[PDB]
Amino acid sequence: IPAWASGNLLTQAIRQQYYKPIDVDRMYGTIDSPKLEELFNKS
């Protein structure tokens, strides 16, 4: 298990994220998504 994903390094990271949320709507809600129609077809 990577260091960042356990114990204290993880806890600290989680806390930081709660108090300093990123603009997810833009950061991920602005990125293209495959059409749901295409999900089971060629990638």
Partner: protein, 270 residues
Amino acid sequence: RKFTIDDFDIGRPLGKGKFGNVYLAREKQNKFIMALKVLFKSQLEKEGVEHQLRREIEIQSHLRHPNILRMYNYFHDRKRIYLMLEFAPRGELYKELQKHGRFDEQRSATFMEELADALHYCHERKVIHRDIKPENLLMGYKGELKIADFGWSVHAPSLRRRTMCGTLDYLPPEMIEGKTHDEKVDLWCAGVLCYEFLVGMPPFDSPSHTETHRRIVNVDLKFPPFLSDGSKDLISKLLRYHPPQRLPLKGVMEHPWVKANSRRVLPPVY
């Protein structure tokens, strides 16, 4: 313009599912921690659940509420579909309830206010959840409720529904009786949930499925002695045989017992 598995550092598995696993992951560009649910395309197809999954994704990906687990985006490769989900640091609510046996009034009231607020956001969009129970809820950094699973959910713009769905102990009378149902089924499940939070067992628990159905349709509610009058008042108002008589979600949020006991905190927003 879109995501691939190489865009994340996989940390460790969080859940073991039967269509795939969920992993704690970090998106590299932003070092943002989230959960990645991985589903196998051939298993989904073989099981015939493609349209079901499509519907779940369509619903969850368009909901934005602090007490509904967010689905940030999704992508797929040759063999897998990846759902990018909000990570709920405190995990499964059912594990917490099992560990404590039952929740105190503050905890329960707080969860009820959050549940009612999220369900109201859904109903305002004509989405009915239909499977509210502890197992479908996760908890945030400050313990905030997060509706996590929408497996039985439906967008029902008009037409009342006919499907029996949900979970035995939580089924409303109308589903058991074969009537059509509407969004008010979530009000009933919210009442069963409140009772189970405070008591640790659902109200109509019985040795057999026909005895449970019988207790539900007769609304055979027996409150244990330790419950407060306020909590029984709220539960009684939600567990009404007639759907139209059930306490509305705004009524749950405004209920004196919820106001007096809830310690709900809204998470910081960007």
